[PDB]
Design an enzyme around this catalytic site. Structure first.
Site, PDB file in Angstrom:
ATOM      1  CB  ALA B  39      -0.906  -0.003   1.223  1.00 26.58           C
ATOM      2  CE  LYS B  79      30.266  -0.328   6.546  1.00 29.74           C
ATOM      3  NZ  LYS B  79      29.116  -1.021   7.194  1.00 29.74           N
TER       4      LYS B  79
END
Ligand SMILES: Cc1cc2nc3c(=O)[nH]c(=O)nc-3n(C[C@H](O)[C@H](O)[C@H](O)COP(=O)(O)OP(=O)(O)OC[C@H]3O[C@@H](n4cnc5c(N)ncnc54)[C@H](O)[C@@H]3O)c2cc1C
Ligand SMILES: Cc1cc2nc3c(=O)[nH]c(=O)nc-3n(C[C@H](O)[C@H](O)[C@H](O)COP(=O)(O)OP(=O)(O)OC[C@H]3O[C@@H](n4cnc5c(N)ncnc54)[C@H](O)[C@@H]3O)c2cc1C
Ligand SMILES: [Cl-]
Lengths: 528, 527
Positions: B39, B79
């Site tokens: 939703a 990273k």
């Protein structure tokens, strides 16, 4: 403060000399080690069976090549444990009875269990068996070993190349002798042959010194108790309670001997045999020109005379003249293996029948842990507690695995076999069985590369009894999952290609059965 | 009754939802019908996500997606470590490292693997020398080659593509979610339905029968996966499974975050996540392409939302009154049980802990790996469920403990927050690890120092997730060291002598990589 300067090992058996060797090597030139042992009545070399990491975890640590020690200890090769008559009623006989169109036996090999799409082969096998696509036993379907073992093949080609994982068979006495010579001659360990008469402790309860029958007094910073079942230091002097675990294992005795063998006429079995009896089981450990054998039984179900009779009668020996060792052992472990400045190593620490050849393993595994948790004179409590934790899990995990051999046998023909079903499995073992019944692997190895495994101790100690071991024993005895592993129904591509794997082992074993020389053949060459 | 699971309904379409759809779709390809209900949520800024190496080997490789493919579509950066700034010095929340014993107050927790020497972790040899006054060099600079090259913003890969160090990624989670949604629906046949769950119908056995949406549609399935986030629509609301608040171990429960534009041409790009200590929490900085995500994770117990907003904006020189910010209140802890009945919680609906050690996305695929491993059939054998729950429980609690140690062992006493952290208690399991550390023992040392075998085999890494290297990086970094050197070393004069060249090799790698590696920006440009 200060490092440990002196170590006194009490006991000169296999454990004592392994301790002297391992510690002498690990602390080379930074600790004075003395081993004190009382010369007393020696016993018959009834034979010892071992596991692969004996070489990688022990002898390699000492820097002793396999060829050097096994030739001097007249050792043979062990590729597996062959369980005989654990599924059929009857008397104790060296010959397998008939079951479902074949001999009643199954193997527990050191051989690797192939993965397949991140799933153990065992799971594919059961799926097919459960759906009726196969009638083949688990060991013969997933391992190449069973067939070449039935033919007494060598685990090494004449040129010396290894075709499978293997351990050793040897007389413990010779190994202890080899290690005594090594420790005293090359590591500087002092050997004193005298008997301990008095152990003096200090106000903190630690051992101050031990006085011998000749009046000699020996002191040290750390005392290693390798005195055997007597637990001269750990149990008697330190008063640490031994925890009996006969509520998990009924066997507490043994009648053993050594039997001459005509290798020329019968060849040499490349495996240890575990022959189910009426009130226990009998081991058969083939060596050069003879085999060690011993009937492990429960004193609560058979008298010593009945055991002697049953035992001699199966090997066709004469009770009256056959030299026999009658042993009574305690089953379980100390509440704490290391207390204060006293560390127990060997049977003074813990013990379980030799059904899975863990005796010697417990010794170097514990020595490995002692060095890993080695203290200084302040004896940091944390190092002791951790060592103790490693020992208890090491022992309890094996205790459970061994209990499973008896708990899941289908036999109900004698009070002994029926009594084993009355026992209670430890919670940890029950959880493993539940997992097994749900189609799950039990302690599957993060990887299926034996090398890494049998070559890296830390990794093996953490995954000692793995999925392969459990399937061999549980499936061998007849305990199988409730239904196939649920994931398999979602892997049509996997359950289809798996056949390539099963076929691969069938070829692998067909080829070895033809190209491999008998163990005897290899042993001759191997041994001068 | 024992036919295989035929239908699976995933409720929730965020990162966890589409990761679940992708993983299960790939794992059960063609033997299960998967539908995901999603939703519309109020959009939020992409404040950044930092990850760990196994994201590629345990997740994307499993899906069959090459690193370059998803990286390019998700505009990801590299990273190499987490750089902890100002955790040992008093002061305001600032992006600039304060001075400590002659240098900046920072220490790295990189992915590098601690070299073993004579069967003993290099960390033990380092402390032995430090304790005896033979060295004053910090643990990370002495034992890892990464710190030096990270201080120079070097790339983890040479221009020719060759990798010189272990690394993970920085990226906007939203982009990864979209990439996966497209992959799952387009390549794995997963059905996407944009609807909102209005009612969950359970049966007399307590299992979920179906969920009815706002449009009146009813979705039935054999297994339900709750990826609804903090509200745990299925696992908590419907199944009523209790959530274990662990604020007695972790004080941080909120965050204020945003995304800041960055001129990579002028400043270059940092090949690391920064964890900046603040007065009432810490702030993350996640460098991406042309911008960086940053957020102040704080404790509502020690700072009001307004105070957090001011400290955070001032630190970055932003206008509190007009800067677009994401104000978030976390649900910290885990469900009593991750999987109950036929409802498996994945993602934040299952558990959550502040992103101090980049475990958010990890918890998702680690759990999906565990779910497939313990996959049930329609009988839902309770043993599979129990084993699954134990794995999740330990995965989370171990991380909870590890994170708490970052705060518990900080030497700071300058604010109520830092002082209160010392007043909380460590779980018994963590205290035991600390007792072991203090006694000079390694904590969960890896079976081997082979980084590949580690980040390459998930079962291996999952079981030894937080290892000795991780613990020394954080503990020694903060200043907690053993009470004395490992007693074993006194019996290894030859080893303590020959280790001097193991430290020398590190120094050589540090110097050579520093002189030959391109900057992260340079490498990013050429890609
Ligand atoms: C029946 C049986 C079968 C087994 N089978 C296997 C097998 O197949 N595989 C395997 O790996 N393990 C097996 N084991 C275990 C194995 O035998 C032992 O682990 C190993 O040999 C070590 O024994 P010990 O040194 O602890 P032990 O042998 O009992 O030695 C005790 C030593 O302490 C000394 N001592 C005692 N008191 C004093 C004192 N007061 N003063 C001075 N010295 C003292 C003795 O003189 C002796 O040297 C078996 C054990 C038994 C009982
Ligand atoms: C501030 C913050 C910083 C973080 N930093 C990092 C980091 O640096 N590194 C890292 O690895 N991880 C990090 N994480 C974790 C990371 O965000 C999550 O692992 C990941 O994005 C998954 O979120 P989720 O899907 O579990 O929940 P959510 O994003 O909350 O998803 C909820 C989903 O459920 C749906 N839903 C809810 N109710 C209904 C309904 N009634 N009907 C239909 N659908 C419904 C929504 O539509 C939505 O798709 C961080 C998390 C936070 C909060
Ligand atoms: Cl590469």
């Amino acid at each position: 403060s200060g490092k440990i300067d002196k170590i006194l090992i009490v006991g000169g058996g296999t454990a004592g000399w392994m301790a002297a060797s391992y510690l002498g090597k690990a602390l080379q030139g930074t600790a004075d080690i003395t081993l004190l042992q009382a010369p007393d009545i020696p016993t018959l070399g009834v034979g010892e069976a071992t596991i692969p990491n004996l070489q990688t975890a022990f002898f390699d640590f000492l820097g002793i090549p396999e060829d050097e020690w096994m030739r001097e200890c007249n050792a043979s090769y062990k590729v597996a444990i062959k369980f005989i008559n654990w599924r059929t009623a009857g008397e104790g006989t060296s010959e397998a009875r008939e079951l479902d169109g074949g001999p009643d036996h199954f193997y527990h090999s050191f051989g690797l269990l192939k993965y397949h799409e991140q799933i153990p082969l065992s799971h594919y096998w059961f799926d097919r068996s459960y759906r009726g696509k196969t009638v083949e036993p688990f060991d013969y379907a997933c391992y190449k070993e069973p067939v070449i073992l039935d033919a007494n093949r060598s685990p090494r080609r004449l040129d010396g190349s290894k075709v499978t994982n293997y351990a050793w068979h040897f007389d413990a006495h010779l190994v202890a002798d080899f290690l005594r010579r090594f420790a005293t001659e090359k590591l500087g360990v002092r050997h004193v042959e005298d008997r301990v008469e008095h152990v003096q402790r200090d106000a903190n309860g630690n051992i101050e010194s031990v006085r011998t029958a000749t009046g000699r007094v020996f002191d040290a910073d750390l005392f290693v108790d390798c005195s055997g079942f007597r637990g001269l230091l750990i149990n008697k002097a330190m008063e640490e309670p031994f925890l009996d675990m006969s509520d998990h294992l009924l066997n507490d005795s043994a009648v053993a001997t050594q039997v001459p063998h005509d290798d020329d006429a019968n060849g040499v079995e490349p495996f240890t045999s575990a022959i189910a009896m009426k009130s226990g089981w009998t081991w058969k450990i083939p060596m050069l020109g003879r085999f060690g054998t011993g009937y492990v039984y429960s004193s609560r179900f058979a008298t010593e005379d009945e055991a002697v009779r049953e035992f001699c009668e199966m090997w066709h020996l004469d009770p009256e003249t056959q030299p026999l060792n009658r042993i009574r052992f305690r089953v379980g472990r100390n509440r704490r293996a290391w207390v204060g400045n006293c560390v127990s190593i060997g049977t003074s620490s813990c013990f379980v029948e030799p059904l899975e050849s863990t005796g010697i393993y417990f010794v170097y595994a514990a020595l490995y842990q002692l060095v890993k948790h080695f203290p200084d004179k302040s004896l940091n409590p944390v190092l002791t507690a951790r060592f103790n934790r490693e020992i208890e899990t090491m022992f309890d995990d094996t205790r459970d695995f061994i209990q499973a051999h008896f708990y899941f046998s289908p036999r109900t023909d004698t009070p002994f076999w029926r009594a084993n079903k009355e026992l209670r499995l430890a919670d940890g073992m029950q959880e493993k069985i539940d997992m097994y019944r749900a189609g799950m692997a039990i302690n599957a190895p993060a990887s299926d590369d034996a090398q890494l495994y049998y070559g890296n101790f830390e990794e093996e100690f953490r995954n000692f009894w793995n999925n392969s071991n459990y399937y061999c024993v549980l499936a061998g005895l007849g305990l199988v999952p409730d239904a196939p592993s649920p994931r398999l129904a979602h892997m049509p591509q996997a359950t289809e290609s798996v056949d390539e794997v099963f076929g691969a082992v069938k070829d692998r074993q067909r080829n070895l059965l033809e190209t491999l020389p008998s163990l005897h053949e290899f042993l001759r060459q191997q041994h001068g």
